[PDB]
Design a protein around this ligand. Structure first.
Ligand SMILES: [Mn+2]
Ligand SMILES: [Mn+2]
Ligand SMILES: [Mn+2]
Ligand SMILES: [Mn+2]
Ligand SMILES: [Mn+2]
Ligand SMILES: [Mn+2]
Ligand SMILES: [Mn+2]
Ligand SMILES: [Mn+2]
Lengths: 246, 245
């Protein structure tokens, strides 16, 4: 199902041009506050699928109050997902539909626009430094955080024995270790998201946030391993699929 | 979905009629052997269901070598449900299909006939002392063991505070405590089947086996919490449904 190389080459070019717009520092007052005072609304996006369907998916956007993490907005919608999944090109599959949900939120409940969006996928921890979380952030201009559930093995990062030893060393929720690429760059952080979970999240900057702020906020959104905004978008979009054929 | 009383009466009557044929002692030479020397084939049966379907189910019979617990025979087939689930009458929902699978095995691989069958459900630990594991045992005349994953609250048995304290007292795989009826009789055993599980199994005699033999064999079949013959029939019958729906 993989697109031809000329197509991937065009997509690489687009990623490299948009990357110039990524802001990888704090631009919002709440981000420099020790307790995120001023942060009121946190967004989460995800896309679920039907096992049989190569065409149909369900895209969900949720907004949660902060710090209580209660759902104040949900839009789950069937969409005609086209492009296949190709590692490093996730945005070309999911991000056009996620942009449409943000625009629907602006049109329907503009006062509930999230101040930051947690994205199910990497940001700058990416083959070309421009993952789905950056891509969504640049297209919507919202602050975004990339949260991935396994390690993207790029710029020398490997899920080898040493990497797994560092995971064992993470002992409680909040513990972290930096992901340092062969380039000298800190690409992201491995984060132990709560006390009763050993498999880390991999957190990276999407847009308009610093890495250390992205980690700390992500930690604060974790009732469970998956940060509550992504988890609710994940749960609600699968439930929606289940309600309509299943 | 509940059947009329006349159907239930006929079912109670059928259970009381077959109960007279239950043999609750060891009748097989391997059963008195300290290591079950001579036991070579252990059977397992289960039926899986479709969430939407009131009609379609998938019944599975597996036979495993002993002591290696490798599957040497599998028969999984889709069937037409004829009766709904009513507690205390499980056999009238599932056991006609299991009997047919046993007869198909006799026709196809008679040398792989199991020497004992582990059944997903109670034996004599039952509202009328004749549960699905006895019912299968009498209809096929094979030795059967009842293995249930929850406690059937009958004859004064309750999943109360005292009961849950005794479960805490089970510390390792093989630990057990007896399930005593109000009459003082031992209906079955609670068994901790695995070191790395806390939730016990409830083991009772089906047919042609004693309780202590049934408990010890059940333990020896447990690679995980669920004894490997029932576990394999469960996995394979669910896989069949999943692939066809
Ligand atoms: Mn606040
Ligand atoms: Mn996702
Ligand atoms: Mn999933
Ligand atoms: Mn998901
Ligand atoms: Mn052998
Ligand atoms: Mn069953
Ligand atoms: Mn089940
Ligand atoms: Mn089952």
């Amino acid at each position: 199902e993989r697109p031809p190389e000329e197509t991937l080459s065009l997509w690489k070019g687009e990623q490299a041009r948009l990357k110039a717009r990524v802001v990888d520092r704090d631009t919002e007052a709440w981000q420099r506050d020790p307790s995120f005072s001023g942060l009121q609304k946190v967004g989460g996006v995800d896309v679920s699928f039907v096992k049989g369907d190569s065409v149909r998916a369900c895209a969900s956007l949720v907004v949660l109050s902060y710090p209580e993490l209660k759902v104040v907005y949900e839009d789950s919608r069937m969409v005609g997902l086209k492009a296949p999944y190709v590692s490093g090109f996730l945005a070309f599959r999911e991000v056009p539909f996620l942009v449409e949900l943000v625009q629907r939120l602006q049109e329907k409940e503009p006062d509930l626009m999230p101040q930051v969006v947690l994205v199910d996928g990497n940001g700058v921890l990416h083959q070309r430094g421009f993952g789905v979380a950056c891509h969504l952030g640049v297209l919507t201009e919202l602050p975004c955080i990339g949260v991935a559930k396994k390690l993207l093995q790029v710029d020398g990062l490997e899920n080898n024995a040493l990497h797994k030893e560092k995971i064992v060393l993470l002992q409680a929720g909040g513990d972290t270790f930096p992901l340092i690429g062969s380039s000298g760059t800190v690409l992201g952080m491995a984060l132990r998201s709560h006390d009763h979970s050993t498999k880390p999240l991999y957190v990276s900057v999407g847009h308009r946030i610093s890495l250390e702020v992205a980690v700390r906020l992500t930690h604060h959104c974790c009732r469970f391993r998956i940060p509550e905004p992504i988890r609710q978008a994940d749960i609600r979009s699968r439930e929606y699929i289940r309600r309509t054929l299943g």
